[PDB]
Write a protein that binds this ligand. Structure first.
Ligand code: HEM
Ligand SMILES: *[C@@H]1O[C@H](CO)[C@@H](O)[C@H](O)[C@H]1NC(C)=O
Ligand SMILES: *[C@@H]1O[C@H](CO)[C@@H](O)[C@H](O)[C@H]1NC(C)=O
Ligand SMILES: C=Cc1ccccc1
Ligand SMILES: [Mg+2]
Length: 227
């Protein structure tokens, strides 16, 4: 009632949030034929993401459809290596090792170990992202991260803090984030409520700046701050 696991013909993405909105039916349950109007309405209805930001994200998602100048995408188009999907994900392995779309327990265990507290703050988020970049560079001989991939990696850590939690304190309960990644269901039962205030492109930019500012390398090894 309100949630159903993907069945045999349903397609899913490397994005835990889109997978979640498909499992709840905010997006089409089968993960196919997502248009700009469906995107605005799903992200609006479930999370209170503003239309300007939903439109921007749809822009990128549409570039993953193999058909050129496309006006829709499917969730599985998003899995195409090095368009939006990138190495050093928090809950997925690098394509080099295996399929980069499904939840990977080994990788997620690394990420969790840097959330050292019941409340995840900007510092813990920044720290987990950084260890995934460094781990992927030293274990994956085909490791790469484009300027777009770097921007998306920083944006993705800002998102789970800002959209799932309180964007003002820039904090989110650890148990809410763990539940979303592990179940691809919204943690309503743990206290998650759709926020009253819309989440905008400038909220995303600001939190991305806080992530960058909380990185303290004596010397940056590779692409750790590109936007
Ligand atoms: C149309 C909207 C969206 C698109 C097209 C999209 C696309 C993507 C893609 C392609 C990835 C994979 C990047 C990688 O290799 O790690 C991803 C990851 C992610 N997305 Fe989304 N996403 C969208 C909306 C959101 C929203 C609203 C959130 C809010 C919480 C979100 C949270 C995340 C997170 C946390 C990850 C990281 C997963 C991981 O690192 O393992 N996304 N998204
Ligand atoms: C991740 O941690 C769980 C729970 O602590 C542990 O039992 C499991 O073996 C770990 N998974 C991997 C593949 O490391
Ligand atoms: C991998 O690490 C080295 C630092 O030894 C750096 O030169 C390179 O840019 C890194 N690759 C990426 C994509 O960050
Ligand atoms: C890839 C997911 C994402 C989600 C929100 C903002 C930037 C990126
Ligand atoms: Mg990835």
């Amino acid at each position: 009632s309100g949630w159903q696991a993907p069945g045999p013909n349903d397609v899913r993405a490397p994005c835990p949030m889109l997978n979640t909105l498909a499992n709840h039916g905010f997006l089409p349950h089968d993960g196919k034929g997502i248009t700009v109007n469906k995107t605005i309405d799903a992200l609006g209805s479930a999370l209170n993401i503003d239309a300007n930001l939903s439109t921007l994200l749809f822009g990128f998602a549409a570039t993953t459809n193999p058909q050129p100048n496309a006006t829709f995408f499917d969730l599985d188009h998003l899995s195409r290596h090095n368009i939006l999907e990138h190495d050093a994900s928090l809950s997925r392995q690098d394509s080099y090792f295996g399929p980069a779309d499904v939840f990977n327990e080994a990788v997620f265990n690394q990420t969790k170990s840097f959330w050292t507290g019941d409340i995840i703050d900007v510092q813990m988020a920044a720290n987990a992202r950084i260890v995934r970049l460094l781990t992927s560079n030293l274990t994956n001989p085909e490791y790469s991260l484009s300027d777009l991939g770097s921007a998306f990696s920083i944006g993705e850590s800002a998102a789970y803090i800002g959209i799932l939690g309180d964007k003002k304190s820039a904090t989110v309960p650890k148990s809410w984030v763990e539940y979303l990644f592990e179940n691809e269901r919204l943690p309503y039962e743990l206290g998650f409520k759709r926020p009253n205030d819309p989440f905008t492109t400038d909220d995303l930019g600001d939190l991305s700046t806080q992530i960058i500012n909380a990185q303290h390398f004596p010397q940056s090894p590779g692409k750790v701050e590109k936007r």
